Amino acid sequence: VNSFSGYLKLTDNVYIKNADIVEEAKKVKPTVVVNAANVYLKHGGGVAGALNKATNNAMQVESDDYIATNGPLKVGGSCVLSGHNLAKHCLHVVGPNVNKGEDIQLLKSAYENFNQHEVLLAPLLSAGIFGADPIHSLRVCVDTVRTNVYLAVFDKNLYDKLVSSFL
Protein backbone atom coordinates (compact mmCIF):
# COMPACT_ATOMS: atom_id res chain seq x y z
CA VAL A 1 0.00 0.00 0.00
CA ASN A 2 1.19 3.51 -0.91
CA SER A 3 -0.16 7.04 -0.52
CA PHE A 4 -1.23 7.80 -4.12
CA SER A 5 -4.95 8.58 -4.14
CA GLY A 6 -7.62 8.92 -6.80
CA TYR A 7 -5.83 7.10 -9.62
CA LEU A 8 -7.53 5.02 -12.28
CA LYS A 9 -5.81 1.64 -12.68
CA LEU A 10 -4.88 0.98 -16.30
CA THR A 11 -2.87 -2.22 -15.92
CA ASP A 12 -1.22 -4.27 -13.27
CA ASN A 13 1.41 -1.54 -12.77
CA VAL A 14 0.26 1.66 -14.46
CA TYR A 15 -2.08 4.19 -12.86
CA ILE A 16 -3.31 7.54 -14.19
CA LYS A 17 -4.88 10.71 -12.77
CA ASN A 18 -5.88 14.18 -13.95
CA ALA A 19 -3.51 16.14 -11.73
CA ASP A 20 -0.85 18.84 -11.63
CA ILE A 21 2.35 16.86 -11.08
CA VAL A 22 3.67 19.78 -9.07
CA GLU A 23 0.74 19.68 -6.61
CA GLU A 24 0.73 15.92 -6.62
CA ALA A 25 4.43 15.84 -5.70
CA LYS A 26 3.93 18.44 -2.95
CA LYS A 27 1.22 16.26 -1.33
CA VAL A 28 2.62 12.78 -1.76
CA LYS A 29 6.37 13.46 -1.36
CA PRO A 30 7.09 10.41 -3.50
CA THR A 31 10.44 8.66 -3.45
CA VAL A 32 10.83 9.54 -7.16
CA VAL A 33 9.27 12.28 -9.29
CA VAL A 34 10.13 12.15 -13.00
CA ASN A 35 11.04 15.34 -14.82
CA ALA A 36 10.49 15.77 -18.57
CA ALA A 37 14.06 16.95 -19.05
CA ASN A 38 16.17 17.97 -22.02
CA VAL A 39 19.81 16.94 -22.48
CA TYR A 40 21.07 20.26 -21.06
CA LEU A 41 18.80 20.09 -17.98
CA LYS A 42 17.55 23.58 -18.91
CA HIS A 43 14.20 23.59 -17.09
CA GLY A 44 12.51 26.41 -18.94
CA GLY A 45 8.94 25.32 -19.59
CA GLY A 46 6.46 22.51 -19.66
CA VAL A 47 6.71 20.07 -16.78
CA ALA A 48 10.37 20.92 -16.19
CA GLY A 49 9.76 24.64 -15.88
CA ALA A 50 6.87 23.97 -13.51
CA LEU A 51 8.87 21.58 -11.31
CA ASN A 52 11.86 23.91 -11.25
CA LYS A 53 9.71 26.94 -10.35
CA ALA A 54 8.23 24.97 -7.45
CA THR A 55 11.80 24.41 -6.12
CA ASN A 56 12.51 28.18 -6.24
CA ASN A 57 15.14 27.45 -8.97
CA ALA A 58 17.13 25.08 -6.73
CA MET A 59 16.58 22.31 -9.29
CA GLN A 60 18.20 24.48 -11.98
CA VAL A 61 21.18 25.37 -9.75
CA GLU A 62 21.81 21.69 -8.98
CA SER A 63 21.34 20.78 -12.65
CA ASP A 64 23.85 23.38 -13.87
CA ASP A 65 26.48 21.91 -11.54
CA TYR A 66 25.63 18.41 -12.84
CA ILE A 67 26.10 19.47 -16.47
CA ALA A 68 29.31 21.38 -15.73
CA THR A 69 30.76 18.17 -14.26
CA ASN A 70 29.27 15.49 -16.54
CA GLY A 71 28.19 17.13 -19.80
CA PRO A 72 24.80 16.66 -21.43
CA LEU A 73 22.57 13.64 -21.13
CA LYS A 74 21.68 11.43 -24.10
CA VAL A 75 18.24 11.56 -25.69
CA GLY A 76 16.62 8.50 -24.11
CA GLY A 77 18.84 8.80 -21.03
CA SER A 78 18.42 9.99 -17.47
CA CYS A 79 20.10 11.04 -14.26
CA VAL A 80 19.02 10.96 -10.61
CA LEU A 81 19.28 14.26 -8.74
CA SER A 82 17.63 15.69 -5.63
CA GLY A 83 13.86 15.97 -5.41
CA HIS A 84 14.24 19.16 -3.35
CA ASN A 85 10.90 20.02 -1.68
CA LEU A 86 8.91 17.82 -4.09
CA ALA A 87 10.25 14.26 -3.64
CA LYS A 88 13.24 12.38 -2.27
CA HIS A 89 14.74 12.13 -5.77
CA CYS A 90 14.06 13.57 -9.20
CA LEU A 91 14.67 11.23 -12.13
CA HIS A 92 15.41 13.58 -15.04
CA VAL A 93 14.44 11.62 -18.18
CA VAL A 94 15.03 12.86 -21.75
CA GLY A 95 12.31 11.72 -24.13
CA PRO A 96 12.72 12.66 -27.79
CA ASN A 97 11.50 16.15 -28.71
CA VAL A 98 9.56 15.89 -31.97
CA ASN A 99 9.87 19.66 -32.38
CA LYS A 100 13.65 19.04 -32.65
CA GLY A 101 13.32 16.12 -35.09
CA GLU A 102 14.42 13.45 -32.62
CA ASP A 103 13.68 9.80 -33.31
CA ILE A 104 10.44 8.71 -31.66
CA GLN A 105 11.77 5.18 -31.24
CA LEU A 106 13.95 6.66 -28.48
CA LEU A 107 10.75 6.99 -26.44
CA LYS A 108 10.96 3.32 -25.42
CA SER A 109 14.57 3.80 -24.28
CA ALA A 110 13.47 6.82 -22.24
CA TYR A 111 10.74 4.84 -20.45
CA GLU A 112 13.21 2.00 -19.70
CA ASN A 113 14.83 4.33 -17.15
CA PHE A 114 11.68 4.03 -15.03
CA ASN A 115 12.40 0.31 -14.47
CA GLN A 116 15.32 1.21 -12.19
CA HIS A 117 12.80 2.54 -9.61
CA GLU A 118 10.12 0.53 -7.83
CA VAL A 119 7.55 3.38 -7.70
CA LEU A 120 7.43 6.71 -9.57
CA LEU A 121 5.22 9.76 -10.04
CA ALA A 122 5.63 10.78 -13.65
CA PRO A 123 4.34 12.73 -16.63
CA LEU A 124 3.86 11.20 -20.04
CA LEU A 125 7.26 11.39 -21.70
CA SER A 126 7.58 13.40 -24.90
CA ALA A 127 4.03 14.79 -24.44
CA GLY A 128 3.16 18.47 -24.17
CA ILE A 129 5.78 20.79 -25.63
CA PHE A 130 7.92 17.80 -26.66
CA GLY A 131 5.45 17.28 -29.48
CA ALA A 132 4.67 13.55 -29.41
CA ASP A 133 1.20 12.05 -29.43
CA PRO A 134 0.29 11.45 -25.74
CA ILE A 135 -1.81 8.40 -26.67
CA HIS A 136 1.30 6.82 -28.24
CA SER A 137 3.35 7.83 -25.21
CA LEU A 138 0.87 6.09 -22.90
CA ARG A 139 1.02 2.94 -25.04
CA VAL A 140 4.84 2.87 -24.92
CA CYS A 141 4.71 3.46 -21.16
CA VAL A 142 2.37 0.53 -20.56
CA ASP A 143 4.37 -1.74 -22.88
CA THR A 144 7.80 -0.77 -21.42
CA VAL A 145 7.54 0.10 -17.73
CA ARG A 146 7.25 -2.88 -15.38
CA THR A 147 7.59 -0.96 -12.10
CA ASN A 148 4.70 0.94 -10.53
CA VAL A 149 4.06 4.23 -12.31
CA TYR A 150 1.56 6.92 -11.29
CA LEU A 151 0.98 9.19 -14.28
CA ALA A 152 -0.17 12.74 -13.72
CA VAL A 153 -1.90 14.35 -16.70
CA PHE A 154 -2.39 18.10 -16.32
CA ASP A 155 -5.04 18.62 -19.01
CA LYS A 156 -8.47 17.24 -18.08
CA ASN A 157 -9.55 17.02 -21.72
CA LEU A 158 -6.45 15.00 -22.55
CA TYR A 159 -6.86 12.78 -19.50
CA ASP A 160 -10.38 11.85 -20.58
CA LYS A 161 -9.20 11.22 -24.17
CA LEU A 162 -6.35 9.05 -22.84
CA VAL A 163 -8.74 7.03 -20.65
CA SER A 164 -11.50 6.60 -23.18
CA SER A 165 -9.13 5.44 -25.95
CA PHE A 166 -6.95 3.21 -23.83
CA LEU A 167 -6.79 -0.34 -25.15
Ligand SMILES: Cc1cc(S(=O)(=O)Nc2cnc3[nH]ccc3c2)n(C2CCCC2)n1
Ligand atom coordinates in the same frame (compact mmCIF):
# COMPACT_ATOMS: atom_id res chain seq x y z
C1 LIG B 1 3.13 22.57 -20.76
C2 LIG B 1 2.39 21.61 -19.82
C3 LIG B 1 1.62 20.52 -20.18
C4 LIG B 1 1.16 19.94 -19.02
S1 LIG B 1 0.09 18.47 -18.93
O1 LIG B 1 0.40 17.56 -17.83
O2 LIG B 1 -1.29 18.85 -18.63
N1 LIG B 1 0.30 17.69 -20.42
C5 LIG B 1 -0.33 18.19 -21.62
C6 LIG B 1 0.00 17.57 -22.82
N2 LIG B 1 -0.53 17.97 -23.96
C7 LIG B 1 -1.40 19.00 -23.98
N3 LIG B 1 -2.05 19.56 -25.04
C8 LIG B 1 -2.83 20.55 -24.63
C9 LIG B 1 -2.69 20.67 -23.26
C10 LIG B 1 -1.78 19.67 -22.84
C11 LIG B 1 -1.22 19.26 -21.60
N4 LIG B 1 1.62 20.65 -18.02
C12 LIG B 1 1.39 20.38 -16.61
C13 LIG B 1 0.58 21.59 -15.96
C14 LIG B 1 0.80 21.40 -14.63
C15 LIG B 1 2.37 20.88 -14.51
C16 LIG B 1 2.70 20.29 -15.71
N5 LIG B 1 2.39 21.67 -18.49
